[PDB]
Amino acid sequence: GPPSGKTYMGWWGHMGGPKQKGITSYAVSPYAQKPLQGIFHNAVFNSFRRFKSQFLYVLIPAGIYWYWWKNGNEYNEFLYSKAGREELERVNV
Amino acid sequence: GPPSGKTYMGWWGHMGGPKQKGITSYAVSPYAQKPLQGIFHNAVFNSFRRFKSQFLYVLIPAGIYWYWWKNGNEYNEFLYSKAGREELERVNV
Amino acid sequence: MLGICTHLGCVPIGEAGDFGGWFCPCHGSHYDISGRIRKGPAPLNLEIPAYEFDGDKVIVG
Amino acid sequence: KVEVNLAAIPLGKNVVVKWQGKPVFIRHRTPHEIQEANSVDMSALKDPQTDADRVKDPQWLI
Amino acid sequence: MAFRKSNVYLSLVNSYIIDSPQPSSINYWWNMGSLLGLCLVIQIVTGIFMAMHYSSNIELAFSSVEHIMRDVHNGYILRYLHANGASFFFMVMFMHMAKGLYYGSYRSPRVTLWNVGVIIFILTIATAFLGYCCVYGQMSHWGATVITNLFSAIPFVGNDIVSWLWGGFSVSNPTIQRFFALHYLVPFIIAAMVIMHLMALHIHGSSNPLGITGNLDRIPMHSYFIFKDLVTVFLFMLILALFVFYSPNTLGHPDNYIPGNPLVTPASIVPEWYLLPFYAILRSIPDKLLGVITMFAAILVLLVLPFTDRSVVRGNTFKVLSKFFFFIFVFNFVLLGQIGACHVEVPYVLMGQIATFIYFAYFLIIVPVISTIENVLFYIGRVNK
Amino acid sequence: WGGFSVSNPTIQRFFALHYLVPFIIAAMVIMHLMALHIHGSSNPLGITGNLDRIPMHSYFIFKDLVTVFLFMLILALFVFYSPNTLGHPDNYIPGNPLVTPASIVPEWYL
Amino acid sequence: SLYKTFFKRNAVFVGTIFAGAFVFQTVFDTAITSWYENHNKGKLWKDVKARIAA
Amino acid sequence: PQSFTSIARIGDYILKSPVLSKLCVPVANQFINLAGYKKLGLKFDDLIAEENPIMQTALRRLPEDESYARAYRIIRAHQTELTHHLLPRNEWIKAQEDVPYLLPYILEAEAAAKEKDELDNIEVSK
Amino acid sequence: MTAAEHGLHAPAYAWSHNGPFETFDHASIRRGYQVYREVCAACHSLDRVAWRTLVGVSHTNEEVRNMAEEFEYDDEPDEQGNPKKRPGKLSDYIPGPYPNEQAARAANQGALPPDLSLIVKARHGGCDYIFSLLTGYPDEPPAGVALPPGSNYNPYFPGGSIAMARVLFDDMVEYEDGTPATTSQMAKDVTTFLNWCAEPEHDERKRLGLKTVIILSSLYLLSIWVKKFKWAGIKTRKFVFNPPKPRK
Amino acid sequence: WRTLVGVSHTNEEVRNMAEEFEYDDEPDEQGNPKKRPGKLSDYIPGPYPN
Ligand SMILES: CCCCCCCCCCCCCCCCCC(=O)OC[C@H](COP(=O)(O)OCCN)OC(=O)CCCCCCCCCCCCC
Ligand code: HEM
Ligand code: HEM
Ligand code: HEM
Ligand code: HEM
Ligand SMILES: COc1c(O)c(C)c(C/C=C(/C)CC/C=C(\C)CC/C=C(/C)CC/C=C(/C)CC/C=C(\C)CCC=C(C)C)c(O)c1OC
Ligand SMILES: CCCCCCCCCCCCCCC(=O)OCCCOP(=O)(O)OC[C@@H](O)COP(=O)(O)OCCCOC(C)=O
Ligand SMILES: CCCCCCCCCCCCCCC(=O)O[C@H](COC(=O)CCCCCCCCCCCC)COP(=O)(O)O
Ligand SMILES: CCCCCCCCCCCCCCCCCC(=O)O[C@H](COC(=O)CCCCCC)COP(=O)(O)OCCN
Ligand SMILES: COC(=O)N(OC)c1ccccc1COc1ccn(-c2ccc(Cl)cc2)n1
Ligand SMILES: COC(=O)N(OC)c1ccccc1COc1ccn(-c2ccc(Cl)cc2)n1
């Protein structure tokens, strides 16, 4: 077939990034190291570190919307009691 | 993606035939010529010429198989008449 | 009279009411005999079919 | 199993049931009547078989 | 070369499954697309084995489903898997979409991939709606009545559209027999859109959680990300089995075990949990025509996001203000579902109105204003004079 | 069968499978076209065609309209003027397990 | 050693994958059924049927 | 997206103004520290999305020595993130090193694209 | 809505079949069917339960064949086209008292009693609501509520007024196994029988789910092991940079 | 019955042919069966019941 409109990604050998010079990589085989090595020093170090960072962005929103659902559910149950029948006929009109 | 195993047909510019040299082609626009120009001198010249060539390859087989269906259908109707009840009880056993 | 409460789809009960007409236990959807809401929060009284008269005929259609 | 029982279908009665959605024929007997069946020899016919192989207690047929 | 690279058909498997270059840093949020493909296989296979025993006539329909439960060998497994499998399919899709919204996957060069996805979502709400009606209990009849009567408000043409949708003058036998034949069809159209969705991913490949290029460090798919995907397949099949075998009717309504009756209205007509936020948006608009427009506009406002994000950085990983308002929008989407399961009473009327506004203001007013503020703060913090 | 004879469970399962298999044929038609694109089409002489090629649009698109309209014409002539000549009359008798026909015959193409 | 008889081979590997699969199912079935029927002793129909002995 | 020409126009106005700079700069500094891209060993211009023609042009015009270092910072950050750790605090980018090394190449390519485009849609007098 | 129009919340009783490893108590099912036959069946149908499904669950084969033969069923017409009757067989379904809806409303002052084959699954609360309903009729209605003539008060029904009157009382049934037939005892056995009518796969389902959850739980742990082994090269790989000379 | 109108007979003719036959009505207020004459939406009846 014909070639189509090209991309921002290539394939192995011509992936399409910048030319690299002066970087060296080292590695060791997995058969030569011991797995399940430190996964405490992981759930107690890193999970608690990752939690402590990204928890005020999730919980301050959650606290505003849950308080809102509360004060509404509390007020509704008052409207349909017998002590809140006068208010019901005021607000429902 | 990667290139796959190649073919015996390419695309425009690299179709994959032999190199040509010394052949010239000429043509005229269809707007400058008249259509429906000779289509008798076609159905009477060329169709009859094409028929006359390839008709003994189709009709000698057709004549052998149709004769065969005939002699069978003729013989069956004789078997189930009253003049062919003696033969029926011979061949059906 | 057709009983398609527009905002309910509810079914007023005969043999009950305040005026010998209608009551539904739906919202307190009281109607009058002719069939006009009276004490229930439903917005309008409902559709009377385009039935005509032709003699041994009422073409409820 | 649409299994009928014994005192149902009488003398002049050969009823076709839908047992297992199958066209099944049930008939009634009288003890004189399997000599009835093997009145013949077998070389007239295809496969030699006998009353004792037909139906177990042949005086009610299925 | 290798056979897997030369053969016409295996070359496509190799380029998509085996040798595909993937960024080294993608996390487990990138595993949801695999699960949605197993989900579609579960539903199509379980549904074809039930269709062998189902009858679509309105007088035979409810009793055919009870016949699958009692008389068919392992038929209670097929239905509960199928019914709870649709609840799981929708939950994995909401998480797949929320991810792309967080990491900026909608942005150029992947605008075409986001748009084919919005189509899959619309066709998937339609499928589930048509199938719930085929049970023909009491939530099935009155749910189809409420939604199909919405199209009678279109000017001058509406009462012709409802009678052509019904096949008559009400939800009746012709309605239930046509909804089953269409419900079998649309899953095969979703599958054809999933192939077009994958073609648009192969061009530029996948993004990564940092929002920068991934062409400097790539890992092949086979035996790093194939075995990373088994981890989440077995967790999905465990939690699903726990619902099918130990709590198989908690994600449903009891009224749909009552057979459908046009003459008795239920006290509360409520959709399944995954259509409740859109059901609250509809009920919030007093007018009938504007309500049905605002509900469909809630699905197609997602197409406006590639032009309203005004930032030079992709994704939210390094963005403080844009993280806070991402999680405002998520919990506002959970309140809309709750309000959609309530009675129309004070104060749940005004709550759903204010929350319908916040759904639309996020895409159209909040994102443009915070993106511009964040750009200028990056500049004056580094370039200060 | 789903039982002991051709019965109700047989007819309900044969309809659900009959809806399915057309969508499997369509997926095999796409794989069929992929295998044609590699080498393209042959020609009536049995030699290479890489020395003289014509594009598809406006030579072979308009050549294909010729046979589309002849196909629709002959089909319309059967649907509207002779719609039961390629069938058997016995299939207008409802199905009965207890009466066998005198001649059990398939359609002409099997 | 062990490697050349159990693991190295790829016919009595994929072989003994299915060999144990057929044997695992039957012992696993018998074991779970026995634990379930014993945990619910006195409520089953077999025990009741023996207890209504009149 | 927004142009760097427009980003610089707004920023320079804020910075030249004394009252606005005393009011908007501390907010911007702590927006930078809370983001946390220095802790992975990146400068801000590493984060700019590069799949567009103005940005592809700026990266070709970049010197070789600055381009080799950019590639290493990006590889080091991907590896730091798949392990779910941070770098040592003695390898964090400092404030004096977080310089806009690529901005002049961007503003030059943008100004040329606007001049070319105006010239292709000109209204001529007679 | 007010709490009356909603109904009173049913409590949580300690049913013997609640739990992931529990089965139905089959002696309570057997006793429950006796309460159905002698109290409920006068005005309620059980149309979706066949005779054969009781064999091996609450009654013996010989017992069920004798219960079915006490009812007459429509046979197919005779040799001249006139209708016939026959006794029941195992493949038949349990018959109801009335022939149509009009006769049912006529015998119950306009109200229609529902079929009970799926009533446990078709009500919020399940077995706790069915039990609390039957045992919830007070002596007097609370002072102020005006009931119509022909309606009865109990607070578990939405609205407060129900067309059914109390039907259970002490020692109206004599059990074959010598159990004291108090009001609560019969109510418990009735609800247990009715839950089996709605969910006849309950006992098989809960043991196939023990097999499936054990197998899938170990595959999930094995998959975590295998992943972390095949990923150990990438996680500990190291990089070094030496700035080259910019000659190039 | 209705398919004969406009083909072989007039509307008034077909209404009178159908009313000469009795059809099963739905049961009365006490559940007993009723009968009624024919209408245009009914089908032409046969001589035998089985
Ligand atoms: C037309 C219809 C369209 C509308 C669709 C609306 C979608 C709403 C659906 C809600 C789906 C659930 C939320 C999914 C959130 C995905 C977010 C994500 O991709 O992960 C973000 C974050 C990753 O953190 P970072 O990559 O920044 O790394 C940290 C620093 N290195 O990791 C996190 O912080 C995730 C923390 C988990 C948040 C939990 C909140 C879930 C809310 C519950 C919803 C269901 C309740 C019933
Ligand atoms: C995307 C795929 C599908 C989805 C999301 C889907 C959804 C649903 C849903 C929500 C129901 C109602 C569940 C309930 O009983 O409460 C249902 C019912 C049903 N569906 Fe599907 N469906 C899908 C594919 C199919 C297919 C391909 C078929 C047929 C081949 C099918 C056949 C049926 C049948 C027969 C029912 C009857 C009720 C039942 O058995 O539960 N479904 N479907
Ligand atoms: C049947 C439904 C779907 C299937 C089977 C499916 C499949 C996939 C798969 C396999 C991927 C690969 C990368 C990944 O898993 O993130 C993907 C990516 C993606 N999908 Fe879907 N998808 C579906 C629905 C959707 C929907 C509803 C949307 C958005 C409305 C969507 C938008 C995207 C985007 C933007 C990406 C690229 C994300 C990135 O590279 O960062 N898809 N999809
Ligand atoms: C039933 C749906 C089928 C469709 C839609 C289809 C479609 C096509 C089309 C469009 C072509 C190219 C034009 C042509 O050569 O006429 C083609 C070629 C061909 N087809 Fe099919 N086909 C179908 C079935 C079959 C079958 C049943 C066979 C053989 C058993 C077959 C074998 C071939 C071959 C060998 C060619 C190449 C002929 C040549 O290039 O000389 N196809 N098909
Ligand atoms: C142990 C004996 C019985 C049981 C367990 C039983 C079961 C039930 C149940 C579960 C309901 C639930 C309807 C609901 O609240 O939504 C009901 C309603 C009803 N029952 Fe019974 N039943 C019994 C005996 C009877 C008898 C003997 C009669 C008639 C004499 C009767 C007449 C009715 C009526 C008329 C209703 C309709 C209530 C209404 O719609 O207001 N019941 N029954
Ligand atoms: C990032 O890159 C990725 C990537 O990460 C992943 C995970 C995948 C794999 C993920 C996918 C979602 C692709 C999987 C494909 C689908 C979901 C499409 C499924 C299409 C269908 C038509 C499914 C239908 C299935 C059937 C079995 C139909 C036949 C029915 C039968 C046999 C039952 C009835 C039969 C009888 C006899 C009763 C990629 O392809 C990919 O691209 C490079
Ligand atoms: C102007 C005149 C017009 C008049 C005529 C009107 C006709 C109009 C319609 C023309 C017909 C459509 C054209 C044909 C076509 O596009 O498809 C046929 C060719 C084969 O399809 P394909 O796209 O190569 O396969 C599709 C493939 O190329 C893509 O593969 P993918 O699915 O992305 O891989 C996923 C597989 C991963 O494997 C798994 C699932 O594990
Ligand atoms: C496609 C997108 C990814 C989604 C997850 C894919 C899940 C399905 C594929 C399963 C992985 C198979 C690859 C194994 C392989 O070829 O390497 C084989 C391993 O095969 C073996 O001998 C061990 C048995 C394989 C374990 C199978 C685990 C679960 C199987 C499916 C579970 C049901 C879904 C080794 O050869 P290789 O290293 O060259 O690849
Ligand atoms: C996107 C939708 C449709 C496209 C689907 C693509 C993905 C489908 C996966 C197909 C699985 C692999 C199928 C068979 C692979 C081997 C084919 C082969 O060996 O080619 C032929 C054998 O011919 C056949 O019988 C084809 C049967 C097709 C089976 C239909 C399922 C011999 O191999 P061949 O020499 O052509 O390969 C060229 C590389 N040298
Ligand atoms: C799963 O089925 C149900 O929950 N259904 O349908 C029987 C139900 C049941 C009770 C009450 C309401 C509904 C319907 O609620 C909704 C809300 C939006 N849609 C919708 C439908 C089609 C399209 Cl294209 C777009 C939007 N439907
Ligand atoms: C169009 O339908 C008919 O003509 N049918 O079928 C009701 C018919 C009707 C009357 C008599 C015989 C038949 C069947 O004749 C045949 C002959 C071969 N196949 C066959 C079927 C399936 C497969 Cl996989 C392979 C071969 N069927």
SS3 of E335-367: the string is HHHHHCCCCCCCCHHHHHHHHHHHHHHHHHHHH
Q: What is the CATH number of the domain that holds E337?
A: 1.20.810.10
Binding residue per annotation — E67?
A: no
Angstroms from B54 CA to nearest CA on chain A: 38
Show the domain range for E114: 3-382
Contacts of I60 (CB under 8 A, 6+ apart): G49
In the 8-state DSSP scheme, what is residue E22?
A: E
Amino acid letter for position I24: F
Amino acid letter for position E45: V
Cβ H110 vs Cβ H58: under 8 Å:
no
CA J32/CA F20 separation, integer angstroms: 48
CA I235/CA A36 separation, integer angstroms: 13
CA B2/CA E14 separation, integer angstroms: 10
What's this structure's resolution in Å? Answer: 2.4
Quick one: how far is CA E90 from the chain centroid?
5
CA A88/CA A75 separation, integer angstroms: 10
CA I63/CA B62 separation, integer angstroms: 76
Cβ I119 vs Cβ I198: under 8 Å:
yes
Angle between helices E111-135 and E138-148 (to 10 degrees): 130
The reply to whether residue A75 touches residue E215, judged by beta carbons under 8 angstroms, is: no
Longest dimension (CA), chain C: 40
Angle at Cα I173 formed by Cα I172 and Cα I176, nearest 5°?
Answer: 155
Binding residue per annotation — F18?
A: yes
* Cα distances (Å, whole numbers) of residue E64 to E71, F5, I199: 10, 21, 16
CA A88/CA I5 separation, integer angstroms: 16
Reported residue count of chain B is 93
Q: What is the CATH number of the domain that holds G33?
A: 1.20.5.260
Amino acid letter for position E67: H
CA D11/CA D30 separation, integer angstroms: 9
| Count of the separate structural domains present in chain E | 1
- Ligand 4 centroid–CA F28 distance in Å is 11
Which residues of chain B make contact with A2, given a CB cutoff of 8 A? 11-12
Query: Counting beta carbons within 10 angstroms of the beta carbon of residue B24, is it exposed (0 to 12), middle (13 to 18) or buried (19 or more)?
Result: exposed
CA J23/CA J50 separation, integer angstroms: 16
Closest alpha carbon to C46 in C55, C54, C36, C38: C36
List residues bridging with D27 in a β-sheet: D61
Closest atom, ligand 11, to C-alpha of F107: 4
Half-sphere exposure of H16 (CA within 13 A, CB side): 6
Q: Do chains A and G touch (3 or more CB pairs under 8 A)?
A: no
Contacts of E328 (CB under 8 A, 6+ apart): A61, E358, E362
CA E138/CA E260 separation, integer angstroms: 4
List residues bridging with I239 in a β-sheet: A25
CA F45/CA F51 separation, integer angstroms: 13
Domains of chain I: 4-200 (1.10.760.10), 201-245 (1.20.5.100)
| Count of the separate structural domains present in chain G | 1
I147-186 burial code (b ≥16 CB/10 A, e <16)? eeeebbbbbbbeebbbebeeebeeeebeeeeeeebeeebb
- Minimum Cα–Cα distance from I227: chain A residue: A35
CB atoms within 10 A of CB I203: 20
List phi, psi (to 5°) of E222: -70, 125
Cβ I113 vs Cβ I92: under 8 Å:
no
In the 8-state DSSP scheme, what is residue A9?
A: -
Query: Counting beta carbons within 10 angstroms of the beta carbon of residue I67, is it exposed (0 to 12), middle (13 to 18) or buried (19 or more)?
Result: middle
Q: Identify residues of H whose CB sits under 8 angstroms from chain A CBs.
A: 51, 59, 67-68, 70-72, 75, 84-85
Cβ I32 vs Cβ I189: under 8 Å:
yes
What sign has the CA pseudo-torsion I129, E273, E282, E191? Answer: negative
Quick one: how far is CA E291 from the chain centroid?
21
* Cα distances (Å, whole numbers) of residue B19 to B23, E323, F42, F51, I172: 11, 64, 21, 9, 108
Any A CB within 8 A of E229 CB: no
CA E223/CA I227 separation, integer angstroms: 9
Which residues of chain A make contact with E19, given a CB cutoff of 8 A? 12
Experimental method: cryo-EM
Is the minimum distance from the CB of E123 to ligand 6 under 6 angstroms?
no
Instruction: Return the residue matching tokens 């319309």.
Output: F76
Instruction: Copy the structure tokens of residue B66.
Output: 């149709």
**Atom 33, ligand 5: residue with shortest CA distance:** I164
Domains of chain B: 1-93 (1.20.5.210)
Q: Which helix (H) or strand (E) holds G34?
A: helix G14-39
CA E196/CA E116 separation, integer angstroms: 8
What is the SS3 assignment for I87?
Answer: strand
Is the minimum distance from the CB of F31 to ligand 7 under 6 angstroms?
no
List phi, psi (to 5°) of I189: -70, -30
Query: Counting beta carbons within 10 angstroms of the beta carbon of residue B88, is it exposed (0 to 12), middle (13 to 18) or buried (19 or more)?
Result: middle
CB atoms within 10 A of CB G50: 9
What sign has the CA pseudo-torsion B68, B71, B72, B74? Answer: positive
* Cα distances (Å, whole numbers) of residue E24 to A47, E143, E217, F92: 21, 47, 6, 67
Is the minimum distance from the CB of F100 to ligand 4 under 6 angstroms?
no
- Minimum Cα–Cα distance from F11: chain E residue: E52
Is the minimum distance from the CB of I186 to ligand 5 under 6 angstroms?
no
List phi, psi (to 5°) of E2: -70, 150
Cβ J40 vs Cβ J17: under 8 Å:
no
Amino acid letter for position E119: I
The reply to whether E202 belongs to the active site is yes
CA D20/CA F5 separation, integer angstroms: 7
CB atoms within 10 A of CB E240: 20
CA J25/CA H44 separation, integer angstroms: 85
Angstroms from G48 CA to nearest CA on chain I: 6
**Atom 18, ligand 5: residue with shortest CA distance:** I113
Any A CB within 8 A of I245 CB: no
In the 8-state DSSP scheme, what is residue I240?
A: E
Size of interface A-E (CB pairs under 8 A): 61
The reply to whether residue B16 touches residue F50, judged by beta carbons under 8 angstroms, is: yes
Instruction: Return the residue matching tokens 């609640």.
Output: I18
Alpha-carbon radius of gyration of chain E: 23
List phi, psi (to 5°) of D38: -85, 60
Any E CB within 8 A of B7 CB: no
Is the minimum distance from the CB of F107 to ligand 11 under 6 angstroms?
yes
Query: Counting beta carbons within 10 angstroms of the beta carbon of residue I131, is it exposed (0 to 12), middle (13 to 18) or buried (19 or more)?
Result: buried
Angstroms from I22 CA to nearest CA on chain E: 11
Instruction: Return the residue matching tokens 């080091």.
Output: H76
B61-73 burial code (b ≥16 CB/10 A, e <16)? eeeeeeeeeeeee
Contacts of B6 (CB under 8 A, 6+ apart): none
CB atoms within 10 A of CB E191: 16
Which parts of A37-93 fold into alpha helices (H)? 46-53, 56-79, 85-91
Reported residue count of chain A is 93
Show the domain range for G42: 1-54
Instruction: Copy the structure tokens of residue I146.
Output: 């005006």
- Ligand 2 centroid–CA E201 distance in Å is 29
Q: Do chains H and D touch (3 or more CB pairs under 8 A)?
A: no
Q: Could you tell me where the beta strands, DSSP code E, fall in chain I?
A: 72-74, 85-87, 152-153, 161-162, 238-241
Q: Which helix (H) or strand (E) holds E314?
A: none
Closest atom, ligand 9, to C-alpha of E195: 1
The reply to whether C7 belongs to the active site is no
Closest alpha carbon to E122 in E243, E329, E295: E295
Percent helix, strand and coil across chain B, each to the nearest 5? 40, 0, 60
**Atom 26, ligand 11: residue with shortest CA distance:** F110
In the 8-state DSSP scheme, what is residue C58?
A: B
> Which of E20, E34, E56, E272 is an active site residue?
E272
In the 8-state DSSP scheme, what is residue E137?
A: B
Angle at Cα E74 formed by Cα E131 and Cα E260, nearest 5°?
Answer: 35
Angle between helices E61-70 and E75-103 (to 10 degrees): 100
Angle at Cα E301 formed by Cα E295 and Cα E307, nearest 5°?
Answer: 170
Domains of chain H: 1-126 (1.10.1090.10)
Closest alpha carbon to A56 in F74, E167, E327: E327
Any G CB within 8 A of I222 CB: no
Cβ J34 vs Cβ J28: under 8 Å:
yes
Is the minimum distance from the CB of E44 to ligand 2 under 6 angstroms?
yes
Q: Which helix (H) or strand (E) holds D23?
A: strand D22-25
Q: What is the dihedral of CA E253, E258, E263, E267, to 10 degrees?
A: -30
- Ligand 7 centroid–CA E191 distance in Å is 13
In the 8-state DSSP scheme, what is residue I157?
A: S
Report the residue of E105, E199, E345 to disrupt the A interface, i.e. the one with the largest count of A CBs within 10 Å.
E345
Instruction: Give the β-pairing of J22-24 and D16-19.
Output: unpaired
Is the minimum distance from the CB of F35 to ligand 9 under 6 angstroms?
no
Contacts of I216 (CB under 8 A, 6+ apart): E234, E237, E238, E241
Instruction: Copy the structure tokens of residue E17.
Output: 């499954």
Amino acid letter for position H92: W
CB atoms within 10 A of CB J38: 20
List residues bridging with J24 in a β-sheet: J35
Contacts of D9 (CB under 8 A, 6+ apart): D15, D26, D28
Instruction: Return the residue matching tokens 């509307």.
Output: J11
CA I32/CA I168 separation, integer angstroms: 13
Any E CB within 8 A of A22 CB: no
Binding residue per annotation — E141?
A: no
Q: Which helix (H) or strand (E) holds J36?
A: strand J35-37
CB atoms within 10 A of CB E8: 14
Half-sphere exposure of G35 (CA within 13 A, CB side): 12
> Which of C8, C10, C26, C27 is an active site residue?
C27
Longest dimension (CA), chain D: 37
Query: Counting beta carbons within 10 angstroms of the beta carbon of residue E381, is it exposed (0 to 12), middle (13 to 18) or buried (19 or more)?
Result: buried
Angstroms from A51 CA to nearest CA on chain I: 21
List phi, psi (to 5°) of F50: -85, -5
> Which of F5, F39, F41, F103 is an active site residue?
F41
What sign has the CA pseudo-torsion E108, E113, E116, E118? Answer: negative
DSSP string for residues in I102-156: HHHHHTTTT--PPP-TTTTTTSTTTHHHHHHHHT---SSPPTT--PPTT-EE-TT
